[PDB]
Design an enzyme around this catalytic site. Structure first.
Site, PDB file in Angstrom:
ATOM      1  N   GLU A   1       0.867  -1.208   0.000  1.00 31.26           N
ATOM      2  CA  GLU A   1       0.000   0.000   0.000  1.00 31.26           C
ATOM      3  C   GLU A   1       0.900   1.254   0.000  1.00 31.26           C
ATOM      4  O   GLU A   1       0.545   2.242  -0.638  1.00 31.26           O
ATOM      5  CB  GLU A   1      -0.963  -0.048   1.200  1.00 31.26           C
ATOM      6  CG  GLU A   1      -2.063  -1.118   1.102  1.00 31.26           C
ATOM      7  CD  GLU A   1      -3.047  -0.927  -0.041  1.00 31.26           C
ATOM      8  OE1 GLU A   1      -2.908   0.083  -0.764  1.00 31.26           O
ATOM      9  OE2 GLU A   1      -3.956  -1.770  -0.196  1.00 31.26           O
TER      10      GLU A   1
ATOM     11  N   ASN B   1      -7.569   8.126  -6.146  1.00 31.45           N
ATOM     12  CA  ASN B   1      -8.342   7.028  -6.797  1.00 31.45           C
ATOM     13  C   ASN B   1      -9.080   7.601  -8.026  1.00 31.45           C
ATOM     14  O   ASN B   1      -9.380   8.818  -8.058  1.00 31.45           O
ATOM     15  CB  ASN B   1      -9.298   6.339  -5.801  1.00 31.45           C
ATOM     16  CG  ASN B   1      -8.632   5.816  -4.540  1.00 31.45           C
ATOM     17  OD1 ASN B   1      -9.100   6.052  -3.420  1.00 31.45           O
ATOM     18  ND2 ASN B   1      -7.579   5.034  -4.704  1.00 31.45           N
TER      19      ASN B   1
ATOM     20  N   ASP C   1     -12.184   7.448  -8.676  1.00 33.95           N
ATOM     21  CA  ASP C   1     -13.475   8.041  -8.260  1.00 33.95           C
ATOM     22  C   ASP C   1     -13.255   9.443  -7.679  1.00 33.95           C
ATOM     23  O   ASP C   1     -14.272  10.019  -7.248  1.00 33.95           O
ATOM     24  CB  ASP C   1     -14.237   7.116  -7.300  1.00 33.95           C
ATOM     25  CG  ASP C   1     -13.595   6.928  -5.935  1.00 33.95           C
ATOM     26  OD1 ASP C   1     -12.512   7.495  -5.693  1.00 33.95           O
ATOM     27  OD2 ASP C   1     -14.158   6.178  -5.146  1.00 33.95           O
TER      28      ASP C   1
ATOM     29  N   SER D   1     -11.805  10.061  -4.813  1.00 35.77           N
ATOM     30  CA  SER D   1     -11.370   9.841  -3.409  1.00 35.77           C
ATOM     31  C   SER D   1      -9.830   9.779  -3.392  1.00 35.77           C
ATOM     32  O   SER D   1      -9.184   9.710  -4.511  1.00 35.77           O
ATOM     33  CB  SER D   1     -12.010   8.624  -2.822  1.00 35.77           C
ATOM     34  OG  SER D   1     -11.512   7.465  -3.445  1.00 35.77           O
TER      35      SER D   1
ATOM     36  N   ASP E   1      -6.466   7.933  -1.018  1.00 37.55           N
ATOM     37  CA  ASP E   1      -5.964   6.975  -0.013  1.00 37.55           C
ATOM     38  C   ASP E   1      -4.808   7.627   0.756  1.00 37.55           C
ATOM     39  O   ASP E   1      -3.894   8.229   0.113  1.00 37.55           O
ATOM     40  CB  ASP E   1      -5.513   5.682  -0.678  1.00 37.55           C
ATOM     41  CG  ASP E   1      -6.619   4.811  -1.282  1.00 37.55           C
ATOM     42  OD1 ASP E   1      -7.816   5.084  -1.071  1.00 37.55           O
ATOM     43  OD2 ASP E   1      -6.249   3.810  -1.895  1.00 37.55           O
TER      44      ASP E   1
ATOM     45  N   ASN F   1      -9.121   5.097   2.614  1.00 35.04           N
ATOM     46  CA  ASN F   1      -9.862   5.806   1.548  1.00 35.04           C
ATOM     47  C   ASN F   1     -10.741   6.889   2.193  1.00 35.04           C
ATOM     48  O   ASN F   1     -11.473   6.574   3.170  1.00 35.04           O
ATOM     49  CB  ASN F   1     -10.714   4.777   0.769  1.00 35.04           C
ATOM     50  CG  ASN F   1     -11.164   5.249  -0.591  1.00 35.04           C
ATOM     51  OD1 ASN F   1     -11.324   6.432  -0.800  1.00 35.04           O
ATOM     52  ND2 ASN F   1     -11.342   4.337  -1.536  1.00 35.04           N
TER      53      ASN F   1
ATOM     54  N   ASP G   1     -15.500  -4.755   8.737  1.00 38.07           N
ATOM     55  CA  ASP G   1     -16.638  -4.295   7.891  1.00 38.07           C
ATOM     56  C   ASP G   1     -17.385  -5.467   7.247  1.00 38.07           C
ATOM     57  O   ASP G   1     -18.432  -5.193   6.703  1.00 38.07           O
ATOM     58  CB  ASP G   1     -16.183  -3.369   6.750  1.00 38.07           C
ATOM     59  CG  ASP G   1     -17.296  -2.509   6.184  1.00 38.07           C
ATOM     60  OD1 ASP G   1     -18.005  -1.876   6.983  1.00 38.07           O
ATOM     61  OD2 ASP G   1     -17.465  -2.498   4.962  1.00 38.07           O
TER      62      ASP G   1
END
Ligand code: NA
EC number: 3.2.1.17
Length: 129
Positions: free
Chosen positions: A35, A46, A48, A50, A52, A59, A101
């Site tokens: 990562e 990202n 979209d 967003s 990280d 995110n 989650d």
């Protein structure tokens, strides 16, 4: 901060990530390698729109607030900037919520693609823990 491998393993263990939701320490260290390369200051945009943040690339779409991710949540109740600190407490506390989650560590696409099913114990080889 750029963590050493064993340095980061020690910090994640101290913060109770070792076998958190059944994921051994090597899984967390492996995820952080791919990562962030163990770099607390890592940021990546990202598709979209967003972003990280930090050693576990958490995110802004769901987990932290960066003020620039329309329609996003802040489920860890933190500014995304807190995820960039040399002190990994906020990253770890937020990672505990993510992994809880329902999809476990598959939430980290790089874990699924690069760590899942591999010899993750190698990531803590040599470490005094
Ligand atoms: Na957000």
């Amino acid at each position: 901060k750029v963590f050493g491998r064993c340095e980061l393993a020690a910090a994640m263990k101290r913060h109770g990530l070792d076998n958190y939701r059944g994921y051994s320490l090597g899984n967390w260290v492996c995820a952080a390698k791919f990562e962030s390369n163990f770099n607390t200051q890592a940021t990546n945009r990202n598709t979209d729109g967003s972003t990280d943040y930090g050693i576990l690339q958490i995110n802004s779409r769901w987990w932290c607030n960066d003020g620039r991710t329309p329609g996003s949540r802040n489920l860890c109740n933190i500014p995304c900037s807190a995820l960039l600190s040399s002190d990994i407490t906020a990253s770890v506390n937020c990672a505990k919520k993510i992994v809880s989650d329902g999809n476990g560590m598959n939430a980290w696409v790089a874990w699924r693609n690069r760590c899942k099913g591999t010899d993750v114990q190698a990531w803590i080889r040599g470490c005094r823990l």
